[PDB]
Structure formats: C-alpha cells, structure tokens
C-alpha cells in the first residue's frame, strides 16, 4: 500500500506483491491516491524483468526516472511541470528490485496532478494446469502550492519563480549572491550543468568562511541540516537545496559555479536568531 508518514515527510509505496503473477487477486487494477507538498519525498519500490514472476513487467512511462504521466494522460518530463524536482532510480541486484525516489522542490508554483502505472499484466506463472497472469497498479499523485520561495540564487535565469534571486548569465560575470537564513528557511542555487561546481557536490562540501574558506564537509559542521542535489536534470541544469532545523551553532559558508569566463558565488549566513 501507499503510506505517507507525516513525521518524516516521506511517502512510501511497495508495488510488488500487489501485481505478482503468482498470487491470486480480486482486482486486476488498483488505484492509490497520494497528496504531496514541497520537500516531500516519494519512494516507490517496484520490480524488474529479472525478478521471478515479473518477467514481462513494465513501467509506464518507461523512462520512469525522467518522466511522469501528466494529467494521467501523456508522458512528460517531470522537470517541465515540477521545476526543480529531483529523481533517482537505483537498482538492487540482490533482490532484483528498483527504488524510485522523487524529491518535491522546496517551492511549488503550480498545483499539478500526474500518475504512474506499474503494469505486470503480461507476466505469467504456471500453477498445475492453470496459467495465472499478473496485475496492474496505478498511482495518482497530487502536488499542492509550495507556500514560500527559496531565499537563494538562480544563476541560470530559468528558475525565476523558484528563487528570490534569478539572473540570466552573461560572459564576464563575477557576481556574489548573499543570503541570510534562520531555522526552517530554505536556501539553494541553480547553475549550468557544464559549469564547475566547487567544492564537490555543494552543499555536501562547502568553503567555510570562518576558517579562511577551507573546504569542509557540511556534516562536519552541522548534523541538524537537510540537503538535496542534482548534478544534471533533463533540462541540463544543476541544483542544490539546503535547510536547517533546530541548529544552534551559527554558520557562514559559500560555493561557486565557474565557467571559462564567469564566476558565480553563493554565500550563506545561517544565524539561529535571524528574523525575517
């Protein structure tokens, strides 16, 4: 079943035994309806052709990592309707299962609906003289408006509604974008994917302003922080998001996106007593 744990902001769905071709089921098609908000995660464990009783299983859309079924109808890149979404689709060669994780961005501008179909109707198992076919499961997902824009820096110009600062990048730019945030306020940035992001996988490592811009892992500065990152989405952009909660130590750090002719620095100051 699909369950949303309101405490972890995570919706988990397991679509394996519901579509197995070895078990008997009343309904050939079952529907799940889930509503998500900004920063929620959707984790779906589903099978592959390599798992017994799922030899002819398939997903719709086939490119599940990049696409959804917009309006339960046509297969579209999720980046087009949910700007800034982050998807991963990782295979487990032991259990023959795949895990799909969708991160809703820290702000959603437009209410959206889409669906995903896990179709095992073509797989079959032989029991005695009977041939039993697998079944189908559909997930209908709804995303609400995102409440607040990210106090951050869009260096691409393509995420103007997602960030408080957004500017198209010209040659010979050398811009520094400053941000002060308190607890439970999102920051982040977007760059061209071919630009060089320094340090590696910001904010996973950052230049610590307090210690002479030395490179440090973020978790060697705070364990009261959540982050996410995508190196290259389907539109060719790099994005990173960060948020603190219940962190009392003050922080000051930065990161850079640099091409052969331009530099873009984001400088974040986290003050646990800053009031907007």
């Amino acid at each position, epitope marked *: 079943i699909c369950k949303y744990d309101v405490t972890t902001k995570v919706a988990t769905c397991e679509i394996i035994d519901t579509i197995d071709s070895s078990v008997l089921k009343e309904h050939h098609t079952v529907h799940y309806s889930i509503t998500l908000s900004r920063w929620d995660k959707l984790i779906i464990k589903y099978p592959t052709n390599e798992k017994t009783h799922f030899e002819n299983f398939f997903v719709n859309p086939f490119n599940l990592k990049d696409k959804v079924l917009y309006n339960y109808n046509k297969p579209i890149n999720i980046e087009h309707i949910l700007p800034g979404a982050i998807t991963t689709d990782i295979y487990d060669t032991r259990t023959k299962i795949k895990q799909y994780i969708l991160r809703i961005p820290p702000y959603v501008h437009k209410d959206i609906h889409f669906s995903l179909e896990f179709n095992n109707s073509l797989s079959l198992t032989k029991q005695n003289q009977n041939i039993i076919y697998g079944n189908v499961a559909k997930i209908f997902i709804h995303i609400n408006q995102g409440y607040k824009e990210i106090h951050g820096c869009d260096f691409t110009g393509k995420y*103007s509604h997602l960030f408080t600062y957004s500017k198209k990048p010209l040659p010979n730019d050398d811009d520094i974008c400053n941000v002060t945030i308190g607890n439970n306020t999102f920051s982040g940035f977007a760059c061209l994917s071919h630009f060089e992001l320094k340090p590696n996988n910001c904010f996973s490592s950052v230049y610590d302003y307090n210690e002479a811009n030395k490179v440090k892992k973020l978790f060697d500065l705070s364990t009261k922080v959540e982050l996410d990152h995508i190196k290259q989405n389907t539109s060719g952009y790099t994005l990173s998001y960060i948020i603190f909660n219940k962190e009392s130590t003050k922080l000051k750090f930065s990161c850079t996106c640099s091409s052969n002719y331009s530099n873009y620095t984001i400088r974040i100051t986290f003050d646990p007593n800053y009031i907007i």
Partner: nanobody
Amino acid sequence: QVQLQESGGGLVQAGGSLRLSCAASEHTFRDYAMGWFRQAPGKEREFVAAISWSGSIKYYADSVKGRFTISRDNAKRTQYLQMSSLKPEDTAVYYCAARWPGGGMWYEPPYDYWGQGTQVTVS
C-alpha cells in the same frame, strides 16, 4: 497583469490609517511580483513596497518600514497595502505595478506594468 486598477485613497488625520487595493483580472497575475510606488508633488516617483508571487516574501522601503503592510490574495488576483500612522510627507499619488521576475532580486525594478494611480492626502 495587463490591466491594473487601484482603489482607495482619501484624507486622514496625522496618525490615522488608510488601505489601498490593486486588482488585475488576468490569470497571469499569479506569476508577477506585486508592488506599490508613490509620487509626491513635484518629486521623482519612489519605491514603497513589494510582495512576491507566493505572497510570503515582502520588501519595504525604509521610508515606510514599520508602518505599511503589503499582502495579496492570488485567488482574487488582488493585492493590498495597509498604511497606518500616516504622516504629512506620505501625501502622494500611489500607483501599483507588477513585474515578471528576473535580472536580479525579485523586488528590484524595472517594473513592467502600471496602474493609473490614486491620491492619498493626510493632515
């Protein structure tokens, strides 16, 4: 956001209040950052306030910080400016304006679309 129209504007005491509204009948109002400017007699038009498209992030000018409040209803496609503790220098023609984000901070000019303006007098 093509059609912007203000409502409100009159006379107040030297410590009273007034409230301006700005309406746009167009759906794309949802996508524009909203703002208020004022122009005094024979003075360059100055920035008053601005609110983001989400309605959650506001930015005020130092001249009005602490007395003026901006907000918006995206369903009705309206925005409002509650002006309290009005002062004789606050006398001006107030216009509302919308801008598509980009080119820097969201609240920073240039603003794209404008209204016709409503007069506000205090004494």
